[PDB]
Design an enzyme around this catalytic site. Structure first.
Site, PDB file in Angstrom:
ATOM      1  N   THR A 151     -10.844  -7.769  -6.715  1.00 19.68           N
ATOM      2  CA  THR A 151     -11.694  -7.593  -5.545  1.00 19.68           C
ATOM      3  C   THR A 151     -13.114  -7.231  -5.948  1.00 19.68           C
ATOM      4  O   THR A 151     -13.354  -6.274  -6.684  1.00 19.68           O
ATOM      5  CB  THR A 151     -11.113  -6.536  -4.602  1.00 19.68           C
ATOM      6  OG1 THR A 151      -9.776  -6.908  -4.268  1.00 19.68           O
ATOM      7  CG2 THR A 151     -11.916  -6.455  -3.318  1.00 19.68           C
ATOM      8  N   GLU A 183      -6.321  -0.476  -0.978  1.00 16.96           N
ATOM      9  CA  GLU A 183      -5.410  -1.370  -0.249  1.00 16.96           C
ATOM     10  C   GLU A 183      -4.106  -1.621  -1.034  1.00 16.96           C
ATOM     11  O   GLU A 183      -3.096  -2.052  -0.465  1.00 16.96           O
ATOM     12  CB  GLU A 183      -6.099  -2.712   0.036  1.00 16.96           C
ATOM     13  CG  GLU A 183      -7.393  -2.596   0.833  1.00 16.96           C
ATOM     14  CD  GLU A 183      -8.650  -2.417  -0.039  1.00 16.96           C
ATOM     15  OE1 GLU A 183      -8.656  -1.600  -0.995  1.00 16.96           O
ATOM     16  OE2 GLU A 183      -9.656  -3.105   0.249  1.00 16.96           O
ATOM     17  N   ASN A 184      -4.158  -1.337  -2.335  1.00 21.61           N
ATOM     18  CA  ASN A 184      -3.048  -1.510  -3.277  1.00 21.61           C
ATOM     19  C   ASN A 184      -2.347  -0.195  -3.577  1.00 21.61           C
ATOM     20  O   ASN A 184      -1.333  -0.179  -4.263  1.00 21.61           O
ATOM     21  CB  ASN A 184      -3.570  -2.053  -4.612  1.00 21.61           C
ATOM     22  CG  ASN A 184      -3.755  -3.553  -4.604  1.00 21.61           C
ATOM     23  OD1 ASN A 184      -4.311  -4.119  -5.551  1.00 21.61           O
ATOM     24  ND2 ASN A 184      -3.281  -4.217  -3.541  1.00 21.61           N
ATOM     25  N   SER A 219       2.635 -15.143  -1.067  1.00 22.05           N
ATOM     26  CA  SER A 219       3.798 -14.357  -0.709  1.00 22.05           C
ATOM     27  C   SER A 219       3.701 -13.579   0.596  1.00 22.05           C
ATOM     28  O   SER A 219       2.625 -13.404   1.166  1.00 22.05           O
ATOM     29  CB  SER A 219       4.125 -13.383  -1.844  1.00 22.05           C
ATOM     30  OG  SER A 219       3.396 -12.172  -1.710  1.00 22.05           O
ATOM     31  N   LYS A 270       9.442  -8.759  -1.111  1.00 18.97           N
ATOM     32  CA  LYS A 270       8.367  -9.714  -1.336  1.00 18.97           C
ATOM     33  C   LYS A 270       9.004 -11.105  -1.419  1.00 18.97           C
ATOM     34  O   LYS A 270       9.845 -11.348  -2.281  1.00 18.97           O
ATOM     35  CB  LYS A 270       7.631  -9.407  -2.645  1.00 18.97           C
ATOM     36  CG  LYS A 270       6.326 -10.198  -2.782  1.00 18.97           C
ATOM     37  CD  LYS A 270       5.637 -10.005  -4.119  1.00 18.97           C
ATOM     38  CE  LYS A 270       4.136 -10.114  -3.967  1.00 18.97           C
ATOM     39  NZ  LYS A 270       3.544 -10.910  -5.063  1.00 18.97           N
ATOM     40  N   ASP A 321       1.521  -4.174  -6.191  1.00 17.73           N
ATOM     41  CA  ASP A 321       0.767  -5.429  -6.332  1.00 17.73           C
ATOM     42  C   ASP A 321       0.400  -5.733  -7.788  1.00 17.73           C
ATOM     43  O   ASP A 321      -0.749  -5.568  -8.192  1.00 17.73           O
ATOM     44  CB  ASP A 321      -0.509  -5.366  -5.487  1.00 17.73           C
ATOM     45  CG  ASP A 321      -1.134  -6.740  -5.245  1.00 17.73           C
ATOM     46  OD1 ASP A 321      -0.599  -7.746  -5.777  1.00 17.73           O
ATOM     47  OD2 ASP A 321      -2.168  -6.790  -4.516  1.00 17.73           O
ATOM     48  N   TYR A 347      10.138   0.908  -0.393  1.00 20.45           N
ATOM     49  CA  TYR A 347       9.318   0.863   0.811  1.00 20.45           C
ATOM     50  C   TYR A 347       8.454   2.109   0.957  1.00 20.45           C
ATOM     51  O   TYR A 347       8.968   3.229   0.992  1.00 20.45           O
ATOM     52  CB  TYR A 347      10.228   0.708   2.030  1.00 20.45           C
ATOM     53  CG  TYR A 347       9.542   0.838   3.367  1.00 20.45           C
ATOM     54  CD1 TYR A 347       8.304   0.221   3.609  1.00 20.45           C
ATOM     55  CD2 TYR A 347      10.167   1.512   4.424  1.00 20.45           C
ATOM     56  CE1 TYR A 347       7.711   0.266   4.867  1.00 20.45           C
ATOM     57  CE2 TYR A 347       9.586   1.561   5.689  1.00 20.45           C
ATOM     58  CZ  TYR A 347       8.353   0.934   5.911  1.00 20.45           C
ATOM     59  OH  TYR A 347       7.770   0.983   7.176  1.00 20.45           O
ATOM     60  N   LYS A 373      -7.178  -0.611  -6.128  1.00 19.13           N
ATOM     61  CA  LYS A 373      -8.015  -0.329  -4.963  1.00 19.13           C
ATOM     62  C   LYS A 373      -7.204   0.391  -3.888  1.00 19.13           C
ATOM     63  O   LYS A 373      -5.983   0.459  -3.970  1.00 19.13           O
ATOM     64  CB  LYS A 373      -8.597  -1.636  -4.426  1.00 19.13           C
ATOM     65  CG  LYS A 373      -7.541  -2.622  -4.028  1.00 19.13           C
ATOM     66  CD  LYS A 373      -8.093  -4.022  -3.958  1.00 19.13           C
ATOM     67  CE  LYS A 373      -7.012  -4.990  -3.518  1.00 19.13           C
ATOM     68  NZ  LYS A 373      -7.509  -6.379  -3.313  1.00 19.13           N
ATOM     69  N   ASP A 384      -6.741  -4.845 -10.604  1.00 18.27           N
ATOM     70  CA  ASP A 384      -7.144  -5.028  -9.218  1.00 18.27           C
ATOM     71  C   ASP A 384      -6.791  -3.774  -8.412  1.00 18.27           C
ATOM     72  O   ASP A 384      -6.339  -3.828  -7.271  1.00 18.27           O
ATOM     73  CB  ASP A 384      -6.472  -6.274  -8.646  1.00 18.27           C
ATOM     74  CG  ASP A 384      -7.060  -6.692  -7.312  1.00 18.27           C
ATOM     75  OD1 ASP A 384      -8.160  -6.211  -6.973  1.00 18.27           O
ATOM     76  OD2 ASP A 384      -6.431  -7.505  -6.593  1.00 18.27           O
ATOM     77  N   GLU A 402      -1.281   1.702   3.475  1.00 16.70           N
ATOM     78  CA  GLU A 402      -2.478   1.841   2.661  1.00 16.70           C
ATOM     79  C   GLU A 402      -3.250   3.152   2.721  1.00 16.70           C
ATOM     80  O   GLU A 402      -3.443   3.737   3.789  1.00 16.70           O
ATOM     81  CB  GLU A 402      -3.447   0.712   3.001  1.00 16.70           C
ATOM     82  CG  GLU A 402      -2.805  -0.651   3.176  1.00 16.70           C
ATOM     83  CD  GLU A 402      -3.831  -1.740   3.422  1.00 16.70           C
ATOM     84  OE1 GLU A 402      -5.000  -1.382   3.710  1.00 16.70           O
ATOM     85  OE2 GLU A 402      -3.467  -2.946   3.336  1.00 16.70           O
ATOM     86  N   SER A 416      -1.558 -14.443  -0.821  1.00 15.37           N
ATOM     87  CA  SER A 416      -1.834 -15.880  -0.885  1.00 15.37           C
ATOM     88  C   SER A 416      -0.549 -16.674  -1.121  1.00 15.37           C
ATOM     89  O   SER A 416      -0.297 -17.684  -0.448  1.00 15.37           O
ATOM     90  CB  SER A 416      -2.860 -16.178  -1.989  1.00 15.37           C
ATOM     91  OG  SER A 416      -2.711 -15.292  -3.097  1.00 15.37           O
TER      92      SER A 416
HETATM   93  C1  LIG Z   1      -3.637  -5.247   1.117  1.00 16.83           C
HETATM   94  N1  LIG Z   1      -2.454  -4.450   1.472  1.00 16.83           N
HETATM   95  C2  LIG Z   1      -1.129  -4.996   1.799  1.00 16.83           C
HETATM   96  C3  LIG Z   1      -0.364  -3.997   2.667  1.00 16.83           C
HETATM   97  C4  LIG Z   1       1.025  -4.568   2.969  1.00 16.83           C
HETATM   98  O1  LIG Z   1       1.316  -5.810   2.304  1.00 16.83           O
HETATM   99  C5  LIG Z   1       1.003  -5.943   0.911  1.00 16.83           C
HETATM  100  C6  LIG Z   1       0.793  -7.450   0.732  1.00 16.83           C
HETATM  101  C7  LIG Z   1      -0.318  -5.262   0.527  1.00 16.83           C
HETATM  102  O2  LIG Z   1      -0.035  -3.991  -0.078  1.00 16.83           O
HETATM  103  C8  LIG Z   1      -0.673  -3.891  -1.355  1.00 16.83           C
HETATM  104  N2  LIG Z   1       1.999  -5.490   0.137  1.00 16.83           N
HETATM  105  C9  LIG Z   1       2.263  -5.958  -1.092  1.00 16.83           C
HETATM  106  C10 LIG Z   1       1.695  -6.891  -1.954  1.00 16.83           C
HETATM  107  C11 LIG Z   1       2.244  -7.084  -3.220  1.00 16.83           C
HETATM  108  C12 LIG Z   1       3.358  -6.357  -3.639  1.00 16.83           C
HETATM  109  C13 LIG Z   1       3.942  -5.420  -2.790  1.00 16.83           C
HETATM  110  C14 LIG Z   1       3.376  -5.243  -1.529  1.00 16.83           C
HETATM  111  C15 LIG Z   1       3.757  -4.349  -0.543  1.00 16.83           C
HETATM  112  C16 LIG Z   1       4.697  -3.321  -0.476  1.00 16.83           C
HETATM  113  C17 LIG Z   1       4.729  -2.465   0.619  1.00 16.83           C
HETATM  114  C18 LIG Z   1       3.816  -2.640   1.655  1.00 16.83           C
HETATM  115  C19 LIG Z   1       3.524  -1.963   2.832  1.00 16.83           C
HETATM  116  C20 LIG Z   1       4.143  -0.837   3.361  1.00 16.83           C
HETATM  117  C21 LIG Z   1       3.645  -0.326   4.557  1.00 16.83           C
HETATM  118  C22 LIG Z   1       2.564  -0.934   5.193  1.00 16.83           C
HETATM  119  C23 LIG Z   1       1.958  -2.066   4.651  1.00 16.83           C
HETATM  120  C24 LIG Z   1       2.443  -2.585   3.456  1.00 16.83           C
HETATM  121  N3  LIG Z   1       2.110  -3.610   2.664  1.00 16.83           N
HETATM  122  C25 LIG Z   1       2.892  -3.671   1.586  1.00 16.83           C
HETATM  123  C26 LIG Z   1       2.856  -4.530   0.490  1.00 16.83           C
HETATM  124  C27 LIG Z   1       5.773  -1.555   0.477  1.00 16.83           C
HETATM  125  O3  LIG Z   1       6.076  -0.636   1.234  1.00 16.83           O
HETATM  126  N4  LIG Z   1       6.375  -1.845  -0.677  1.00 16.83           N
HETATM  127  C28 LIG Z   1       5.797  -2.946  -1.470  1.00 16.83           C
HETATM  128  O4  LIG Z   1       5.180  -2.395  -2.635  1.00 16.83           O
END
Ligand SMILES: CN[C@@H]1C[C@H]2O[C@@](C)([C@@H]1OC)n1c3ccccc3c3c4c(c5c6ccccc6n2c5c31)C(=O)N[C@@H]4O
Length: 277
Positions: A164, A137-138, A22, A39, A151, A89, A135, A133, A94, A20
Site C-alpha cells: 500500500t 487494515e491488516n 479471494s 479464505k 494477510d 476469526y 498496515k 504490506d 480492523e 483481488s
Molecule cells: C482490508 N481488510 C480486510 C478486512 C476483512 O477481510 C480481509 C480481506 C481484510 O483483512 C486484512 N481479510 C483477510 C485478507 C487476507 C487474509 C485473511 C483475512 C481476513 C481474516 C479476518 C477478517 C475479518 C474479521 C472481522 C472483520 C473483517 C475482516 N476481514 C478479514 C480478513 C479474520 O477474522 N480472520 C482472517 O485473518
C-alpha cells in the site's frame, strides 16, 4: 490427523472481506459450533493470473505461524473449483476501524498496541519472514482486543512487489528491494497514525505520495507525545540499515529498550488486559 474437512461441514455466513483473488467468509463448523474465517479462492482465476506461487507461499507462511499475535491456519481443503483456508476469526475487525471511531489513541493505548505489534514483528522476523504490506487494515482485533496480524499473500520468506502506497518504504521505490526494515518503516507510519489519527505521507495520488516518501516529507503535529515522536524519527529513516530494530542496528533489544516502552512488560503481552479505547 482428523479427516479432511469439506464445504458441507460448515454453515457459511457473512462476507468479512474481499481481496483481488479471494473472499473471506465467516463460517460455523456444524460438528463443533466453532467459528472460522475461511479464505476462499478460485483455482481458475489464480492460474490465469499466475498467482500459484503467491497462494502457495501464503499457505506455507501461515502454516508456520504459531503465535498469539498472528492469524492461525487450522486447515485447508478444496472442491473442484475452489481453495479453502480455515483461519482464526478476529471478531472485532480492523484496527483502522478503532482509529477512526476514537480519532486517535491516547498514550497508554498507543504504547500498548505498538508494543504488541513490535512483539509480533520480533517473532515474525525471527523466523526470517517479512510481511511487506503491514498496515492498520491488516492488523485485526480478536474478541479480547489483542491484535491478530494477517494477510500473508504478499510475504517474502528469506523484489516483485509494492504494497500500500502510504506504507511503502523508500528502498522499495528506489531499488525494488525489501527486507525486515520495510516492516519497521511501516511500523513507524502506523505509530504515527495511532497518535496523529492519520498516516504521515498523504497526497492526491500515489505518484505524489511516493514523492513525499523519498524526500522524507512529513511532519509531526504539536501534540505528538515526545517519546513516541522520537521513536518514529528513529523508524522513518531513509537508510534502511539505520532503522531501530534491524540487524545493522542490532535488532529488537534496542528497539524494545526505547524510552517510549519504559513501562512495558514484554514477556506476557497477550496475557495483559488491553486498555479501553
Ligand atoms: C482490508 N481488510 C480486510 C478486512 C476483512 O477481510 C480481509 C480481506 C481484510 O483483512 C486484512 N481479510 C483477510 C485478507 C487476507 C487474509 C485473511 C483475512 C481476513 C481474516 C479476518 C477478517 C475479518 C474479521 C472481522 C472483520 C473483517 C475482516 N476481514 C478479514 C480478513 C479474520 O477474522 N480472520 C482472517 O485473518
Amino acid at each position: 490427523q482428523p479427516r479432511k474437512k469439506r464445504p458441507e461441514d460448515f454453515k457459511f455466513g457473512k462476507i468479512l472481506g474481499e481481496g483481488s483473488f479471494s473472499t473471506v467468509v465467516l463460517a460455523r463448523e456444524l460438528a463443533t459450533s466453532r467459528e472460522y474465517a475461511i479464505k476462499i479462492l478460485e483455482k481458475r482465476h489464480i492460474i490465469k493470473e499466475n498467482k500459484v506461487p503467491y497462494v502457495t507461499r501464503e499457505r506455507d507462511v501461515m502454516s508456520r505461524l504459531d503465535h498469539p499475535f498472528f492469524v492461525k491456519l487450522y486447515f485447508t481443503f478444496q472442491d473442484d473449483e475452489k481453495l479453502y483456508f480455515g483461519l482464526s476469526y478476529a471478531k472485532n475487525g480492523e484496527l483502522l476501524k478503532y482509529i477512526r471511531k476514537i480519532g486517535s489513541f491516547d498514550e497508554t493505548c498507543t504504547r500498548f498496541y505498538t508494543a504488541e505489534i513490535v512483539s509480533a514483528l520480533e517473532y515474525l522476523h525471527g523466523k526470517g519472514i517479512i510481511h511487506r504490506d503491514l498496515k492498520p487494515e491488516n492488523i485485526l482485533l480478536n474478541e479480547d482486543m489483542h491484535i491478530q496480524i494477517t494477510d500473508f499473500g504478499t510475504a517474502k520468506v528469506l523484489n516483485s512487489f509494492v504494497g500500500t502506497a502510504q506504507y511503502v518504504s523508500p528502498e522499495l521505490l528506489t531499488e525494488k528491494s525489501a527486507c525486515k526494515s520495510s516492516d519497521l518503516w511501516a511500523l513507524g507510519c502506523i505509530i504515527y497514525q495511532l497518535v496523529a489519527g492519520l498516516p504521515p505521507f498523504r497526497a492526491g495520488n500515489e505518484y505524489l505520495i511516493f514523492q513525499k516518501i523519498i524526500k522524507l516529507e512529513y511532519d509531526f503535529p504539536e501534540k505528538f507525545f515526545p517519546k513516541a515522536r522520537d521513536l518514529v524519527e528513529k523508524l522513518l529513516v531513509l537508510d534502511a540499515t539505520k532503522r531501530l530494530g534491524c540487524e545493522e542496528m542490532e535488532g529488537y533489544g534496542p528497539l524494545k529498550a526505547h524510552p517510549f516502552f519504559e513501562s512495558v512488560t514484554w514477556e506476557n503481552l497477550h496475557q495483559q488486559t488491553p486498555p479501553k479505547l
